[PDB]
RNA sequence: ACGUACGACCAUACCCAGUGGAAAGCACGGCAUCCCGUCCGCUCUGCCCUAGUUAAGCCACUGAGGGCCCGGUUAGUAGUUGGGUCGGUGACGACCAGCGAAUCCCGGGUGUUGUACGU
RNA sequence: GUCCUAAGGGGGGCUCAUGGAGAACAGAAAUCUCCAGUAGAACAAAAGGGUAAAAGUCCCCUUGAUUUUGAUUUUCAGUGU
């Protein structure tokens, strides 16, 4: 059984511009992902109220935010035309980023866990393209 | 228009209702959707008159926010 | 009043149309024996937010004079006040004194056994929280008398004792606590006051099943003398005010649900 | 085990109090036996307490608020003394009476606000009070003096302690007024 | 003239047990048991918060009319049982004793035959509600940055509904009237002990191997304590009633009565009066 | 018990004072005079009452002071000491353990003079105390020094002879 | 039984002094980077629990002088209401009742206790 | 005849009158220190038990000088938002 929120748990600032995207991460609540308009993303810990990890790197608004279903990954699609990866558990960008759309970059989507294959997770990305 | 607070000619052309260029009014704010702290719906605030009524045919009026 | 924390005090002192709870005084007279002084440290105990404290002697006969009783009361704002006393013929006495406009309205004595007086601090159970209004149970023939009468006054004053603040609404995790009062109508009849710790166990109904604990005190009491309220003074402290959330209804008048 | 209980008379209730009368005698044994004696009261306060759950989880609407679940209790209905007499209206003062005689409305709340605006200056100002416009002008660099007046004038007063003069006479006066007030309700 | 004579000693009043002890304000006290803005009779519950040298205290509290009673109670030494050994009297220590006494209340609740008439008279729309309590500091100044609001903090991270603002965390900026959750993080995990072991293994050597001592002797560097203290959030929330067994000798219940009774020194008998009354007399008159 | 290390008599404060009894200037030259002696910020005190005699007035500042602890408050009690040649008389010991005297210029102190600034004298008063003084001075668990942790005069004296090589007369 | 934290009665617990205190705990203590606050890190606040010490706090016991608290006695007595009921025209003198003291004196005592965690 | 960011409210820290013993001028009476101090000071009232980690006294914040709503109470309304 699920009980309903009735009451504010934490208020943490630290993004200096609207929130746009936020997601929790599959394994547990005690990790969230946030994705802002001053071009960053943040990772919160839940149990204490407290920033974890700032990821930058984005030159537009971080548009979406999205934990791979395993929890091993989280992908940022921005208004920079670009989509990056990251590893949640240091908050450094995986490799590069991922270039090849024209236009805004305003989902994401990956492939489901028992899907994988050759031996790598794969990532949609959709456009105003 | 809820009522009319305050023309500042007159008090008694503010128990008339006179509706002139600097005259606090209170409007009906439940279309701009307002939610006070505590969660309530606030549906009456106050605004003022800005323009000149008998002249224009209308009222216009920016709330005192 | 120039202060305006006295004017504060003088507005609250002030007669209202919604009463304030009633204040109690507890006090003693130049003779009180240990027996009354844990009893009326057991009503105090019961009482405690709503009660203020005497700690010396007083040489006061209620039944003689009272301008002393009347003197307390407007002084401490205090209506309800309980009187310690013991002598020869009256060996422990609890006088019950319930005033109107700082003046004795009537009064009861109550005399207690003292070979069956048991404290609060001989159960060993969970007792009740500070402040807490308990549930209550008056039972037995003594207290329906066609005509007003020692038990009926009796009822009456520990009904304005135990009555606590009133409320519109109350939690159910707050009737944990029954006053019990017992008194057959008849060689005088004995006014037993018991209280109770109230566990709720499952019966397989909606409705659970009650069972009792013995909380403290353990008390007997025989009625004595008593003081009656004047006909005019009963009839003014007996008057009902309206308040001003109660609309005074008019013929082929009415509200709307809207 | 039941949790309804039978008597020859039906208990009575005031729920505003969380009072449950029992009609029926309290049949208590005569022996001598302090346990059994106990035993007894407590069984007679066992069906006290029941009865009274059962009432207020019967008869009274439940609501389930953050606060807990709540019992919506009626009014008191035993009747208790006060503990002072009702409040009366108090006797009607000199200006009282002349004002309903002559038909003198109350001012409004906006009508008697310690407020105006000064032109002169073009601000708003108190009438009265602390920087009142009724001392004005006893703060001011400079002031006008009629030759007549400081002719007339007492040695060693100024003309800056004029205005509070006058506030002093007219508060005596008000002062005098309330207390005759004062004096006559109090004999009435 | 003497001011203490009789009639001083017959007249003087004295104050309450522990207002002479200096221990509790009855002031404070009252507000805070017998003041309500509610009267809907229901209990009420307040998280005690108290400090020693070497221990931090903490209980929850309910007032009876003989005497209170503790629902639950986390002392900063059962920290051992969960990895922490040094600074038991810290921030980190203070906000992890308040998340064990936070969640011990909620496992003797079970939120983690006798039943309650809130179960009895449950309606169909209704939801779960928090534990309900109040922050309790004694005489301790509630200055920004003390360590009660510490074990507040650690109190409803764990799950106790506490009425409390942040204007007095540390990191609170009183002009911008913001508050810096990177100083906050920084306080909860210990890092202020982290950059003070730094800075004075930088500066004062000497100075920092007497007050860190402890830490050096059990190899406990500065930039582990974060992950310590982490750590130690997680065990607390896994296994909130852990057993620990301390250093000290440990004998039953009756041992310790006997250990007792045999330094205890005896009220001296009547009989035993009257004769060092006789002897007194005695020596007085030779 | 006596050789307990924690009834070893240690300077709890040394407080300097300067009553010059008039408000304005004087009460400036001497405030700045106490700032540049201790190294902090002095107190200024208002007069209790208002004596017609002395001239002065209530709620009227008069008199300047500096409370001075640890190492510097024992070296400016020893520059006080220099300047009165480590001599003191047997009444300026309280029967509380505490001493004091005074100066009337404050130049063979060790400061330079300064003609805009002038003379000025002082009172030095010395409170000892023993370790455990904490216990009446916190805020909670406030209690009273026991009688044998109480420091008299004779005991005042002796540690006076014996740390400054001092004589009392 | 001892210790600590919250307490309940609020001197049988207060005022003054002396002696002792296993264990653990309290405490005195040590250090001013950070949070915080002072004329002064005295207090308050933060960091150590290592090192010294039971000297003081605290606890127990003892001792005077006070004070305070129980019980008896005073005593159902003073005093006060009743022609109340007998005389006295009446006032009043007894008697009958109802209420109802205190001083003096004697004896005893100088803290009991709840919840939780420990020694 | 003068002076004041008014009074009030909330929070926090502190303890007063007086006496004893000490400190250059300073001497009954100027300021500082310690000890003892049931309030014997202050502030309100007219206690026969007002208030001491405060109701006293100093800091911080508000000072916005009489808010909004009401089908309800009482009175009024030839100008009945």
Known sequence: KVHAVSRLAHRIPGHGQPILSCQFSPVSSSRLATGSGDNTARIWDTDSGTPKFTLKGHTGWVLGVSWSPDGKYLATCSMDTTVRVWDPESGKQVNQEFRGHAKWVLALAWQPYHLWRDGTARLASASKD | ?65 | PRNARSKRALEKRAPKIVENPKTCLFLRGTTCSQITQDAMNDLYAMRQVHAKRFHKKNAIHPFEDATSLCFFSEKNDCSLMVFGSSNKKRPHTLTFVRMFDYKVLDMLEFYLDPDTYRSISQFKTSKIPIGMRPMMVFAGTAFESPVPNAFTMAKSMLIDFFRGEPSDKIDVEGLRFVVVVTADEPQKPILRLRVYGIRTKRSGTRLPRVEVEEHGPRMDFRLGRMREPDPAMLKEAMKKAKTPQEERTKKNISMDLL | LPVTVEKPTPYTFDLGLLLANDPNPVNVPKTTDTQVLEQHLASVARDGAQVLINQLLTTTTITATKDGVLLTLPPPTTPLPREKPVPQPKPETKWQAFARRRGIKPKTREQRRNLQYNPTTGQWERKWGYKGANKRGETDPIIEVSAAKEAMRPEGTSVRGDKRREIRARVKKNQKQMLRNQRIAAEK | KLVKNSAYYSRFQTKFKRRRQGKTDYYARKRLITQAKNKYNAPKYRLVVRFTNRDIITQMVTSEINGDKIFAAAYSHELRAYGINHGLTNWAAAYATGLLLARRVLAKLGLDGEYTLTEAAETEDGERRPFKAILDVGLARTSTGARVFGVMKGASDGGIFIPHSENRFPGYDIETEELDTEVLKKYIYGGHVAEYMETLADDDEERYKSQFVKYIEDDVEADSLEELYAEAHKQIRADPFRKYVSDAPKKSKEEWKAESLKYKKAKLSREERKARVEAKIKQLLA | ?169
């Open chain 6, 1 to 169: 018990k006596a050789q307990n290390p924690m009834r070893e008599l240690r300077i709890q404060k040394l407080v300097l004072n300067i009553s010059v009894g008039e408000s304005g200037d004087r009460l400036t030259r001497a405030a700045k005079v106490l700032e540049q002696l201790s190294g902090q910020t002095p107190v200024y005190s208002k007069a209790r009452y208002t004596v017609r005699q002395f001239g002065i007035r209530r709620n009227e500042k008069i008199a300047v002071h500096v409370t001075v602890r640890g190492p510097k408050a024992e070296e400016i009690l020893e520059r006080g000491l220099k300047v009165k040649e480590y001599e003191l008389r047997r009444r300026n010991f309280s029967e509380t353990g505490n001493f004091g005297f005074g100066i009337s210029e404050h130049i063979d102190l060790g400061i330079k003079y300064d003609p805009s600034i002038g003379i000025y004298g002082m009172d030095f008063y010395c409170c000892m105390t023993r370790p455990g003084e904490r216990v009446a001075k916190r805020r909670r668990c406030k209690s009273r020094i026991g009688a044998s942790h109480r420091i008299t005069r004779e005991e005042t004296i002796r540690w006076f002879k014996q740390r400054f090589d001092g004589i009392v007369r």
């Open chain 2, 1 to 65: 228009i809820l009522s009319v607070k305050k023309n500042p000619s007159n008090p008694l052309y503010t128990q008339l209702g006179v509706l002139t260029k600097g005259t606090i009014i209170e409007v009906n704010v439940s279309d701009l959707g307002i939610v006070t702290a505590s969660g309530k719906i606030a549906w009456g605030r106050y605004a003022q008159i800005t323009n000149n009524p008998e002249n224009d045919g209308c009222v216009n009026a920016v709330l005192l926010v």
